[PDB]
Design a protein around this nucleic acid. Structure first.
Ligand SMILES: [K+]
Ligand SMILES: [K+]
Ligand SMILES: [K+]
Ligand SMILES: [K+]
Ligand SMILES: [K+]
Ligand SMILES: [K+]
Ligand SMILES: [K+]
Ligand SMILES: [K+]
Ligand SMILES: [K+]
Ligand SMILES: [K+]
Ligand SMILES: [K+]
Ligand SMILES: [Mg+2]
Ligand SMILES: [Mg+2]
Length: 1338
RNA sequence: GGGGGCCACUAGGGACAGGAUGUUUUAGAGCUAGAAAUAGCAAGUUAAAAUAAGGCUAGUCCGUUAUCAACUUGAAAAAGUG
DNA sequence: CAATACCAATCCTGTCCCTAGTGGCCCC
DNA sequence: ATTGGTATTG
């Protein structure tokens, strides 16, 4: 008994099928367990497992880290209160108690209800003097009076609880004075430089224009307006842009050929300026210097909207400005609405449900929505012009706690905090003694390289301690070993050397590593001149001379430099041919040049004695990012360099690690030669062996030592192995499920293994936010104004043509012309490399053009003429990252010969041969599970051949022989895909056994193109209908003579298999996990649905959550008390155990149930019922548990094959294509069988009346179908497709028939399944335990 | 076919440290005329505290991923059953 | 019981590791 | 986008 297995692996399904040698699907009797009539059941060996998607770990991470942050913010407040504890006890022994219980209703409060002062008079007076906390903050900063300790606490607590970002390094002492004087100084330095060309800045209010309430770029254009001439892209224009955004490339300004863009915020600035001034002269230094001198006073013009000369609390002052302008404008607006539109005043100022001022303060209206609601009301009235100005600046009636405060650096809150402490430490000594500790509470962050401050019970932590004591913000430096922790941060994540698994990998920017890469590439170079008989390698002396002359003097080495600066100057060659490198060398000694610029001592870098030192230095600059730690580590070499050099060295940081260790590159030595790998790369006679040759040469010690160093260790489990594969958790779920299905199938077949296993894996399948970001970055990098003229929202960028329009700066890609948005319907979306070769539908292969004809010829890449015309525009788009390097290269391919015949052959092969790593891992898993025995030569015995196919094989097979697929009809198509996979794969390797190299796991261009294009012709009776050819009726193997395909019987076999109505569709039952409930914190309500957010927070007083998620339901057979007498009454019901309740219910089920009300629970009749638990009722009707109180449809509609194929054809599903005569034949079949439509609706109808039970919906559907009987056949079929939403397995859903919408009929009761048959199914559904639940009751 | 190093991109996975809102209850004395219902007017911008219930291992830690038919012997982890 | 209508926390900064898809140089 | 919870209406 021989058989094969077909598998179809998806993100929500695994289809499976068992076939015999005749491509038939067997059917068996399977034993049935339980307590019913039925002892056994017939099952066809074909089906599909269905499951909800595996989820990434991301959401879990976001919640975990937010959790740690709430914990630590509470701890900050706790530190501050502990510092205040005793003196506050002297002032008010319950103040902190009133703060802690502020949330409590007065009934539940232990202390007086007014938090700050504990009496209504003082509290009301406080709020009258300080309407916002920023009033009190500014007062405590500016005043000199002794202040109440509770108000000092509140100011400091508010600063520490909402402390601002940490994105700017160092100290920040704001000063907005001299802004106009600094601008005058910048204009002065520019005019003293270009004495011949001066700018007159007199009268230019740079302070207002630059501290403006609008954007940086608008400020720039306004400022340039005031300078006669001086176009915005002139030198001074870009110098003003310096503080106002990222400056365009000074390339144009200084006649350069390289990019010269700067950004004062970027760390590279100090280098780039030096990189730039060296090109243009140090005399320009002062210029950029004055530029920086302005930016400091204007850096925070957006945050601080008040002069610092009047207050040391400019932030709080700007909030108070918000408050005062809100007050004045609200007074004015109220008066205006009273005068002009009284009939609306209420709706504006009282209706919380409208987006007016009421809904803005009290309702749920955001600033944006309030602005949108009130803009027409302001435009409709008179005297609202200033308010409209403030509105369009987004500065009308502002609150103080707003979504855009994320710009505020922590240094500003710190300044205000420090100032309050300095004011009040003169009156309170503990504030003087704890000044720095409180500042430290504000400033301290756990470093990202330290991680959670755990003590052995966190699976996420790696931090190590110098001593064992509680870590505080003030002793962190002494208790945490920051160096060891920062090291572990990297070493727990980075790979070891695969060749020497005990060896750490080198930094990617190590000098030794770059020497290795350069010398590898260099040894494989060859050259020819005239007198030479044969191309020659480079000798050791030649490679050394090339490194010293070129690689050690230029960062990049072009082939042109190699020809002219070495072979011409040293070898006196005028002509030489080079192989092994094209255009320029890929490797390079970049770190060498970095350090040459920093330390300025070539001999130091060339001296081998310093090697270790330099390696260590680069290690330090890679392992660590904190420049104080970098400094501490480099301190050991302080005597070797000047202090200036050490300051420059501190700032030189590197990221990235290599893939080889130092011991491999320049450590282990070949026994007889005594030479390392790098030694051989420098000089290896006339063989010039590279790394691979070196470590594989049986003539050297390297290979043997690598073999010796290897070690496997402890092996993973199947689940662990699958979890560690590189792929989407979605598809890893399907992989594990596939292995389990195969195991069960083998056990079904008497533990005999199959001949073949054919596997196929599906393709690759918020985001509009990313699209908008791409387009914004590109258009700004373009310097284009297409967004200024045609604004767009991210949603619309999901349209392919509009997205392409914006990615192409609104132009044609094949013609140097503009395009019109309003004409997008008339344009074309063309494939760069045609889809007849590469089935790529991504933006990377697509281009928007007026007419695709203008590409050139359609059998290749765009023509040479288009390339000549458009290459510079394409380069522009590439530099804006509006097209990728791959897109640009494919576009320009015609200047490199275009598509060759070998390329087309390879494209066909790629269309047919799978090469994704993940599918190969699935094949390896199955192969290593199936084949375990070795032969007399200790080589593997491959009993089972694992064949992988791409979906195009079976898709083409379906379309060519009319085994059509309609996905919406039911879930059978997964199983049918698996079956067709087994059939086609086994036939394909039976017919061409030599294909086993390509399709089976384990160890002229026209010819392969033709071969692979025609690989599947042995199925057809008549091919190429080139010229026409004919094939026999029976197809056998050429060598063996064995029969592989009988075109008489086997197609009928396939039709019989696809027609079978009994297909094992199993929806995987799963316990629900994740969040307890909806997160929304609802207001108080008289409802038992509400859930307390804290143990003593009665939701009837405090609000809380509702809508918890049921982890699983439970059958309870017990008694409940009834009526006022509490008489015991027997019941049977489903109890939904919620996710939050699960641990308690499982720790003691009986106590849990009795707390819920149940008595005398039959403990052994408790049945755990996860989501999708399957029940059968009458007439085959099935239901699945959706919840404890709702059900899902549980049946599949087995629509006969003739109706499926008729629907596919009549709906023009996908493409017709075909011969014109074959098109006409399919069309004539459609029209000849129009009655099928009614028959289909009859089938559905019958099904719905037996199984769906949605009378109203079925009647609406019948009425709609009878209404649209004169519609075209195509459209009626297209909507009949939609009708199957009514009958689909799973949760009910809404669907449209033409323009009538049918809402979902839900099953809002689970009572009936309590007396139905529960069906437990194995993974394949071939093994069942059926339980008659009607036999359970009191 | 499979595999390695390097260059140029691109797509995804994982961890850590942080920021701004939002919500919820309480505090921010509403007034006047009416018994009242209600009407007219005034006011509004801020704060505290929680932000999965909670847990024990008590850490400035952990709490939403992965994995799960039934039955059996099993504390479990397992293995087995048609 | 129904049928049905509404609802669902959001956005952002930085450090770092890893695999794998496309094209290319050189190899096992 | 789904789809299970919830109140509302009857
Ligand atoms: K101008
Ligand atoms: K609001
Ligand atoms: K190159
Ligand atoms: K680094
Ligand atoms: K020194
Ligand atoms: K789960
Ligand atoms: K889930
Ligand atoms: K936050
Ligand atoms: K199952
Ligand atoms: K992030
Ligand atoms: K590659
Ligand atoms: Mg907590
Ligand atoms: Mg808030």
């Amino acid at each position: 008994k021989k058989y094969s297995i077909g598998l179809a692996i998806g993100t929500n399904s695994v289809g499976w099928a068992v076939i015999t040698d005749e491509y038939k699907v067997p059917s068996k009797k399977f034993k049935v367990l339980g307590n019913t009539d039925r002892h056994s059941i017939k099952k066809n060996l074909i089906g599909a497992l269905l499951f909800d998607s595996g989820e990434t770990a991301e959401a879990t991470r976001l919640k975990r880290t937010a959790r740690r942050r709430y914990t630590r913010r509470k701890n900050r407040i706790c530190y501050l209160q502990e510092i205040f504890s005793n003196e506050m006890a002297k002032v008010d022994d319950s103040f902190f108690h009133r703060l802690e219980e502020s949330f409590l209703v007065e009934e539940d409060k232990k202390h007086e209800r007014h938090p700050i002062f504990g009496n209504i008079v003082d509290e009301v007076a406080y709020h009258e003097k300080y309407p916002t906390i920023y009033h009190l903050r500014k007062k405590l900063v500016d005043s000199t009076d002794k202040a109440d300790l509770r108000l000092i606490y509140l100011a400091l607590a508010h600063m520490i609880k909402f402390r601002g970002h940490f994105l700017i390094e160092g100290d920040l002492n704001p000063d907005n004075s001299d802004v106009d004087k600094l601008f005058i100084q910048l204009v002065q330095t520019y005019n003293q430089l270009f004495e011949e060309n001066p700018i007159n800045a007199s009268g230019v209010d740079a302070k207002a224009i630059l501290s403006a309430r609008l954007s940086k770029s608008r400020r720039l254009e306004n400022l340039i307006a005031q300078l006669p001439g001086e176009k915005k892209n002139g030198l001074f224009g870009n110098l003003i842009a310096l503080s106002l955004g990222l400056t365009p490339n000074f390339k144009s300004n200084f006649d350069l050929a390289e990019d010269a863009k700067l950004q004062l915020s970027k760390d590279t600035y100090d280098d780039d300026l030096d990189n730039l001034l060296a090109q243009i002269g140090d005399q320009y230094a002062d210029l950029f210097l004055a530029a920086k001198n302005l930016s400091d006073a204007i850096l925070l013009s957006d945050i601080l909207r008040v002069n610092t000369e009047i207050t040391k609390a400019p932030l709080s002052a700007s909030m108070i400005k918000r408050y005062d302008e809100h007050h004045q404008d609200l007074t004015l607006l109220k008066a205006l609405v009273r005068q002009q539109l009284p009939e609306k005043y209420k709706e504006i100022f009282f209706d919380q449900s409208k987006n007016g001022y009421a809904g803005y303060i009290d309702g749920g209206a955001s600033q944006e929505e309030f602005y949108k609601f009130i803009k027409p009301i302001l435009e409709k009235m008179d005297g609202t012009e200033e308010l409209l100005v403030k509105l369009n600046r987004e500065d009308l009636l502002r609150k103080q706690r707003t979504f855009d405060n994320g710009s505020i650096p922590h240094q500003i809150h710190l300044g205000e905090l420090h100032a309050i402490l300095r004011r009040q430490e003169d009156f309170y000594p503990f504030l003087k003694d704890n000044r720095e500790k409180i500042e430290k509470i504000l400033t301290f962050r756990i470093p990202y390289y330290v991680g959670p401050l755990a003590r052995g019970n966190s699976r996420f932590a790696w931090m190590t301690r110098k001593s064992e004591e509680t870590i505080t913000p003030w002793n962190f430096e002494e208790v945490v070993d920051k160096g060891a922790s920062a090291q572990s941060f990297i070493e727990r994540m980075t790979n070891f050397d695969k060749n020497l698994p005990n060896e750490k990998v080198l930094p990617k920017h190590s000098l030794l590593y770059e020497y290795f890469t350069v010398y590898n590439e260099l040894t494989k170079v060859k050259y020819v001149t005239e007198g030479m008989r044969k191309p020659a390698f480079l000798s050791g002396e030649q490679k050394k001379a090339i490194v010293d002359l070129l690689f050690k003097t230029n960062r990049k080495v072009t082939v042109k430099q190699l020809k002219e600066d070495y072979f011409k100057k040293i070898e006196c060659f005028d002509s030489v041919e080079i192989s092994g490198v094209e255009d320029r060398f890929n490797a390079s000694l970049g770190t060498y040049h970095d350090l040459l610029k920093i330390i300025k001592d070539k001999d130091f870098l060339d001296n081998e004695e310093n090697e270790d030192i330099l390696e260590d230095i680069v290690l330090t600059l890679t392992l660590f990012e904190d420049r104080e730690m970098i400094e501490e580590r480099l301190k050991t070499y302080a005597h070797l360099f000047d202090d200036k050099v050490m300051k420059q060295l501190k700032r030189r940081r590197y990221t990235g690690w290599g893939r080889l260790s130092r011991k491999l590159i320049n450590g282990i030595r070949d026994k007889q030669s005594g030479k390392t790998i790098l030694d051989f790369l420098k000089s290896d006679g006339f063989a010039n062996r590279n790394f691979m040759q070196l470590i594989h040469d049986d003539s050297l010690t390297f290979k043997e030592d690598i073999q010796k160093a290897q070690v496997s260790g402890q092996g993973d489990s199947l689940h662990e192995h699958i979890a560690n594969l590189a792929g989407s958790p979605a598809i890893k779920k399907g992989i594990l499920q596939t292995v389990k299905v195969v195991d069960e199938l083998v056990k079904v077949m008497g533990r005999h293994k199959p001949e073949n296993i054919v596997i196929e894996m599906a393709r690759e399948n918020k985001n509009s936010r990313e699209r908008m970001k791409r387009i914004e970055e590109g258009i700004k990098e373009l310097g284009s104004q297409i967004l200024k003229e045609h604004p767009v929202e991210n949603t619309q960028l999901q349209n392919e043509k509009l997205y392409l329009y914006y990615l192409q700066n609104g132009r044609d890609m094949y013609v140097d012309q503009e395009l019109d948005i309003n004409r997008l319907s008339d344009y074309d979306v063309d494939a760069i490399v045609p889809q007849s070769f590469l089935k790529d539908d991504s933006i990377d292969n697509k281009v928007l053009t007026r007419s695709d004809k203008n590409r050139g010829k359609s059998d290749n890449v765009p023509s040479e003429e288009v390339v000549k015309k458009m290459k510079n525009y394409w380069r522009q788009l590439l530099n804006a990252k509006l097209i990728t390097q791959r897109k640009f290269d494919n576009l320009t391919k015609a200047e490199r010969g275009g598509l060759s015949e070998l390329d087309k052959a390879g494209f066909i092969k790629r269309q047919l041969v799978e090469t994704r790593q993940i599918t190969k891992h699935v094949a390896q898993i199955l192969d290593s599970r199936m084949n375990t025995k070795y032969d007399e030569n200790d080589k593997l015995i491959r009993e089972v051949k694992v064949i992988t196919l791409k979906s195009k094989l079976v898709s083409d097979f379906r379309k060519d022989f009319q085994f059509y697929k309609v996905r919406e009809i039911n879930n059978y198509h997964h199983a049918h895909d698996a079956y067709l996979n087994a059939v086609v794969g086994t036939a394909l390797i039976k017919k061409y056994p030599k294909l086993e190299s390509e399709f089976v796991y384990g160890d002229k261009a026209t010819a392969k193109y033709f071969f692979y294009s025609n690989i599947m012709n042995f199925f057809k009776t008549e091919i190429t209908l080139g010229e026409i050819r004919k094939r026999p009726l029976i197809e056998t193997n050429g060598e063996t003579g064995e029969i592989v395909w009988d075109k008489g019987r086997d197609f009928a076999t396939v039709r019989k298999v696809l027609s079978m109505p009994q297909v094992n569709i199993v929806k995987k039952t799963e316990v629900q996990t994740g969040g307890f409930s909806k997160e929304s914190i609802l207001p108080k309500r008289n409802s038992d649905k509400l859930i307390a957010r804290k143990k003593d927070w009665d939701p009837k007083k405090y609000g809380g959550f509702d809508s918890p998620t049921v982890a699983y339901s439970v059958l309870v057979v017990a008694k409940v008390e009834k009526g006022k007498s509490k008489k015991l009454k027997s019941v049977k019901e489903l109890l939904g155990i919620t996710i939050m309740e699960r641990s308690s219910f499982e720790k003691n089920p009986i106590d849990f149930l009795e707390a819920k009300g149940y008595k005398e629970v039959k403990k052994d009749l408790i049945i755990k019922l996860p989501k999708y638990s399957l029940f059968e009722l009458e007439n085959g009707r099935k239901r699945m548990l959706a919840s404890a109180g709702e059900l899902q449809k549980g049946n599949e509609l087995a629509l006969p094959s003739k109706y499926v194929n008729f629907l596919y054809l009549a709906s023009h599903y996908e493409k017709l294509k075909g011969s014109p005569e074959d098109n006409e034949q399919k069309q004539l079949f459609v029209e000849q069988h129009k009655h099928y439509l009614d028959e289909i609706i009859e089938q559905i109808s019958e099904f719905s009346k037996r199984v769906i039970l949605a009378d109203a919906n079925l009647d609406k559907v019948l009425s709609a179908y009878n209404k649209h009987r004169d519609k075209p056949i195509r459209e009626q079929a297209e909507n009949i497709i939609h009708l199957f939403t009514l009958t689909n397995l799973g949760a009910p859903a809404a669907f449209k028939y033409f323009d009538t919408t049918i809402d979902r009929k839900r099953y809002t009761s689970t009572k009936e399944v309590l007396d139905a048959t529960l069906i437990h199914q194995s993974i394949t559904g071939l093994y069942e335990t059926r339980i008659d639940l009607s036999q359970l009751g009191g």
